[PDB]
Amino acid sequence: FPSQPKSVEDLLDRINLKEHMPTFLFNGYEDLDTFKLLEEEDLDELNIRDPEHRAVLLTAVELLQEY
């Protein structure tokens, strides 16, 4: 779909979390078919601790299951 996130970078840009882009792309989450596997415990391992960031990321992951 033309309107869909094209990459992890595009998705993080859309949800205003580009600060986490090196964290995901240096820890094996460089492709959207892997990003869509994220769960809360995976954000702990990635040291992503801000509850607002965490909720935003897990909402975006739910939307990719639709994809």
């Binding site: 995901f24 820890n27 094996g28 078919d33």
Partner: protein
């Protein structure tokens, strides 16, 4: 093709062909018995790659059970 090397390429994890081969996983049937420890012991360290490989194994076992 239910080759280990074809399975890895299908999930974009062909970089681990030599890791699986060295660890003795010559069939997919041997891969389907793996757990997270088996994956780490091949020398696979990137978190998301561990997660993608195990998730694929979990799904393939469910699709062959029934």
């Amino acid at each position: 093709s239910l080759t280990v090397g074809d399975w890895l390429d299908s999930i974009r994890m062909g970089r681990y062909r030599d890791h699986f081969a060295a660890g003795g996983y010559s069939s997919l049937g041997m891969v389907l018995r793996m757990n997270a420890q088996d994956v780490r012991a091949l020398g696979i360290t990137l978190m998301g790659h561990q997660k993608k490989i195990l998730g694929s194994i979990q799904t393939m076992r469910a699709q062959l059970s029934s």
